[PDB]
Amino acid sequence: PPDLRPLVPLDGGRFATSDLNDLYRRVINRNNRLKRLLDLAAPDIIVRNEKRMLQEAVDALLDNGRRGRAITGSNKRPLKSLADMIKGKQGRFRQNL
Amino acid sequence: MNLTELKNTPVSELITLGENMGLENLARMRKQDIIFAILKQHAKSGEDIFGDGVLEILQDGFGFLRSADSSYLAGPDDIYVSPSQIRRFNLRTGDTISGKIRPPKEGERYFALLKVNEVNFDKPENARNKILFENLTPLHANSRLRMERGNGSTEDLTARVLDLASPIGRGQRGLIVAPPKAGKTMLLQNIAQSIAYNHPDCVLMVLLIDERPEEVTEMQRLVKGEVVASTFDEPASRHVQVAEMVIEKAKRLVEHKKDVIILLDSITRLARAYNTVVPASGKVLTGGVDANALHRPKRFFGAARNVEEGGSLTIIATALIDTGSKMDEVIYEEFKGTGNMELHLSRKIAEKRVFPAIDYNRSGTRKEELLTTQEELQKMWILRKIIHPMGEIDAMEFLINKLAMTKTNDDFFEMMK
Amino acid sequence: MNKEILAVVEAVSNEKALPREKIFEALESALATATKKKYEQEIDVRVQIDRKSGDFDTFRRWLVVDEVTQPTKEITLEAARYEDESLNLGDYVEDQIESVTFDRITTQTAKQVIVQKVREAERAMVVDQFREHEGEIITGVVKKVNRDNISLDLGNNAEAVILREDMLPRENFRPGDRVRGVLYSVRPEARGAQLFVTRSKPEMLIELFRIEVPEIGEEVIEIKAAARDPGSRAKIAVKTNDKRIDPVGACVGMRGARVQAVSTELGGERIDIVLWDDNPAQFVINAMAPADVASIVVDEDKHTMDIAVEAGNLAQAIGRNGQNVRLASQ
Amino acid sequence: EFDAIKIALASPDMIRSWSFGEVKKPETINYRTFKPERDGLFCARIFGPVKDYECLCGKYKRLKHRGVICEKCGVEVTQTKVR
Amino acid sequence: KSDDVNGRTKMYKNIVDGNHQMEPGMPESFNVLLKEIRSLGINIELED
RNA sequence: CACAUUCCAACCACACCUGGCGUGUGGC
């Protein structure tokens, strides 16, 4: 849900966004690029690489860092995924339940 | 029990009538509360009411029926109408409607329209079979609207010079250009009288925007026709409101194949109003007028045209000049070349107390060849050639004398030979 | 700064309604009050902002009197040899100069006193331009009603007050109607409403005739005597300078055509139109009219008049509240 | 009120039933105006009205029009808690 | 006292009116967890 | 004719604010 995604208007034109927003946006971007490439009859290797990249994006959105490459979104720090919002001493169970 | 029957009679008749009906002192209430309480107490005896009024569209969807007693404004006696009636019977602004009405029911505060009986003096069955205004094919004026009475009274001269200076027709576009206190009011009154006498078939309406109340009360009982007005007692919101009311009434009536003639006084007041109610758009020129502040006067004036299928809409407005403020001038400026007929009155002639003070050659009518015949046109050209070399004032006096010797303009034309 | 002063004097809405001279006078009063509130001592100060040549310069008024209380504004009527007075009265000094006129409290008091001065000036102006028409019938919509007074608008923010004594006891008011009366009193120094319009007074009747009767206004039928009872009855004696004109057919009208109109204007007031006469006898007979008078007693020492009415016509000569007599006494 | 909780796999049809719309634009909001995107990550007709009892286009903002959608944006006017 | 979006208001209204009685409702953060698990490919559901 | 709502003397509705996340430091 949108309001369940942290996004608050910070001081100035910048907005305090969540780590899930970047994940969802990258997923949507790669999905749209894949849909475009499928219509233009892209080469088999190109659509193969695009499917691989979309798979990387969706598994990073699911559980970042589990695949092996912990991607960062900002500050060169590990990004927060959906699994991270449940596990550890910072998930919902340990902090909000 | 009809709404107009209490709408037109003066306040005194309402007083005696309510005092007869055993009322609380009605002298403490307004005219609208007078009619409201009287209709309340009449329906409390068990009568189904009939009413009439001009419709106004609101942005919430529903409509309200106004009268000419309130000059088409909000009042306690306005008749509420649902949007679904506006849908089924195809209602819109300007549609005058008369039919079955009841007072507001339990918890309501405005009358409700039960059953439509007359839409713009027509059967509500054919009211859906109407032609729109913008889809009309305008034309020039062909039918002549003779303004001369022929009785030869003292003031009738100010009408005959009309037939000699600037001809009028059904659907004409006329602009009165005159400084203040030159004689526009008496001219307009004579225009209204002559039209109501010679052409009682066409509906006659007059606009008074930001005028004095004495002029309003003298106008409403001098002309044979339903008049609407708005003095300076009220904000410009009232002026623009009555402006849509009257213009949409004229539009719907001409859509019903009727000849409408509107006399507007004055267009300068209406332009000031339209400018002061319009928000600022960042486009300001000399005088203090917004660039889009004139779109509404342009709309109201371009509403005039001559329809081909039947009916026409003549709009004759007066503009004010020489008022010391450049803003007024700028208004007249954009209204310089927009009209095809003009009545130019110079203060130099009115300064000698010789009436009517009309500038002959500065006045004229475009495409006037289709309004008059060949003999009349040739005689007009000869008169213009005779009056052109002379000045304004005593040349107007010459026309006044040549007009006063003869009874109607036929004798004047024959003498001019 | 002074540029702000010029921007203020040029950014006013009612520019001619309150001209530059009186604008700068109000600003001088503002700066004087500011300087007064600056020092703990009370001292009168003139500013002379120099409307177009230069900036402001405060001064120090003396108010020359033989007192010594707060000598900042005290000096004797004879101190004139040194400091170059040479006067008897009005000796003021120009010692303190160049005060501050833009801080917080100065801006506050300036705004307040400017609001007060502009509203007072505009009220006095809109009342004074109508003062020339004192004693005439005017139109105008009412503004607000109350149990003590009502407000009326004559157009262009023309505020007029009508007190309870000017209103009839059962006169009817509602915001929206045009109650017409006659202007009778003006007080251009009043802190509040000062335009006084009445309808209960007999002069209005004259003005009523002045707007209804064409005979009056040409001094052919002079209105001499007039007494009133609001909403109940008005007794008027009008004389005829000519001989072929009868007020019963001229001032009354044609079978109640004018008397009825002025009664409806006055809210149902009985109007006894009689003739003024140079004889007290006929005058009091017409005063108690209609009746049958069969007696006249006059006393100039006590200024009394005895009228023994006929037996039976009591209600015809006295009636309710003795109005037919009371108005005669009035 | 309710008994035990059940958990299982999510069928694609079940997800589509849960879905009140589809996000196609990768944009969340605009820089100048703080109103949400048309059908981006933050939408109105998909999730709900950003404000309480006020639509996105501002046409249906009164409590009388509460309960219906608009003709252009099509946002069911209700409380923002539905988001 | 913490999570009920509609209980804390009701409890405050009852207390200020002299009513010391509560209503369980449902914790909002629990619905948040339900939505988060639902956001995954996992279906969580409350029975009867 | 019917469905459906009705735009304004105090005032009820138009309220009130950054732990998103990390880092550093200190205390128990």
Ligand SMILES: [Zn+2]
């Ligand atoms: Zn909307």
